[PDB]
């Protein structure tokens, strides 16, 4: 077990989104954060490189330093064996009912939790925080003295039975269940005690920093976009059910119209994913030789600063996944006040306020003429962008969620 210390995007404190929050809030904030002052609410995940949530909690720890909670990040060590079985576990977990949780996994798994639980004394701090599986299973390797909270970053609506109710040995223990919608909160879990969390964006990280004019010029010229026609959008994962190729149909539809249409399909995937660089190359065989389409991928170069670029020069930004989960991206677009057009599934339903913030469509042709109806009214494209990016701001920041952080512990 280890510990972060150190803090990539640096110092972040509440005062680094004064400008973005108001005063009204940092003191909702500052005040909310002061009945835990000088507290222990510690953290504990599987590392602090290759993830989204790492890159969270980069900011979220030294946020909660900033305002009075003496937070800290401990981090978990292991072989190949360990992560290659907890990624087992993951894709067990989400689904995926083919794979079988064997005692030799069952013996590695708690092992590694046990010799990364006698580096640290979890049990000592007022308020403690595990994230994911890897970790899951410290709680029983310490007396409990304080709370211990599980958050939860993946789907558990139709978890692997196998390796549900080996987890759950370990995360009924913890006084409280963090999930990010309210559909991921397995039954198996007393729903009192379970948590309503959805993920937020953090204003000032790559992906979303403001950029300036020249360089998403920059980016733009790179990969052969043109800024002076029209742009249409869709940032997500290359696999079969996120409206891919419907997304692709909406561009051809409406590109009989405005012949300068230009489509986006923007993706940022692990080398080891090879389900998403098949369906990748499969989108390329399908657009054929039309170039108005891009195709922008890390494969490429692009990666979270590019993806910011793409999505401040996009028109209109689309989401027709046909299964989702929270869909931070359309977080992202709707903080760049862009209006959004997506099926109503996962965190895309709740996020868009049909008709306000975005659209809410069912099929293609739904799609299509959302977007010629925005793409001609740019001034009401303006406004869905404005409250859409108001929504955000109120209740899908790094802020706000860490807000939603003290609410939870001054509820202990
Ligand atoms: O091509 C991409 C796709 C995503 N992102 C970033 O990732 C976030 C969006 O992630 P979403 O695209 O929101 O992630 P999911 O597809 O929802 O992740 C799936 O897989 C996760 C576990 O890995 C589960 O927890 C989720 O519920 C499940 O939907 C955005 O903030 C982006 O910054 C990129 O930069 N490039």
Redesign the pocket.
């Given at each position: 077990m280890y510990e972060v210390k150190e803090f990539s995007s640096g110092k972040r404190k509440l005062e680094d989104y004064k400008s973005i929050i108001g005063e009204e809030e940092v003191s909702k904030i500052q005040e909310k954060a002061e009945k835990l002052k000088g507290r222990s609410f510690v953290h504990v995940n599987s590392t602090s490189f290759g993830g989204?949530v790492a890159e969270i909690l980069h900011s979220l720890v030294p946020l909660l330093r900033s305002i009075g909670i003496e937070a800290r990040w401990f981090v978990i060590e292991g072989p190949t064996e360990f992560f290659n079985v907890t990624k087992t576990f993951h894709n067990a977990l989400?689904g995926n009912e083919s794979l079988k949780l064997t005692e030799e996994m069952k013996e590695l798994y708690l092992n590694v939790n046990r010799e990364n639980s006698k580096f640290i004394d979890l049990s000592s701090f007022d308020y403690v925080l595990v994230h994911d599986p890897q970790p899951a299973a410290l709680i029983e390797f310490y007396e409990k003295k304080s709370p211990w909270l599980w958050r939860c970053?993946?789907?558990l609506s139709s978890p692997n039975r196998e390796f549900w109710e080996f987890l759950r040995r370990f995360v009924e223990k913890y006084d409280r269940y963090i999930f990010?919608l309210p559909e991921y909160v397995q039954p198996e879990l007393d729903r009192n005690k379970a948590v309503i969390m959805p993920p937020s964006?953090d204003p000032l990280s790559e992906?979303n920093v403001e950029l300036k004019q020249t360089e998403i010029l920059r980016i733009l010229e790179r990969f052969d976009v043109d800024p002076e026609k029209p742009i249409i959008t869709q940032?997500?994962?290359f696999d079969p059910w996120k409206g891919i190729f419907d997304v692709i149909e909406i561009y051809r539809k409406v590109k009989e119209k405005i012949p300068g249409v230009q489509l986006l399909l923007?993706?940022?995937?692990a080398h080891d994913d090879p389900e998403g660089w098949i369906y990748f190359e499969k989108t390329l065989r399908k657009i054929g030789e039309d170039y108005d389409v891009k195709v922008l991928t890390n494969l490429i170069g692009v990666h979270?600063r590019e993806?910011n670029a793409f999505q401040r020069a996009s028109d209109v930004i689309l989401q027709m996944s046909i299964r989702?989960?929270?869909?931070?991206?359309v977080?992202?677009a709707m903080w760049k006040g862009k209006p959004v057009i997506g099926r109503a599934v996962?965190g895309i339903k709740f996020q868009i306020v049909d008709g306000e913030t975005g659209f809410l469509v069912r099929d293609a042709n739904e799609a299509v003429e959302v977007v010629l109806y925005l793409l001609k009214h740019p001034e009401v494209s303006k406004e869905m962008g404005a409250k859409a990016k108001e929504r955000v701001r109120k209740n899908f920041i790094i802020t706000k969620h860490m807000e939603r952080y003290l609410d939870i512990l001054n509820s202990l």
């Open positions: 989204g989400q970053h993946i789907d990010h964006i992906k940032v997500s994962r923007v993706g940022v995937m979270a993806v989702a989960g929270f869909g931070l991206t977080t992202e996962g």
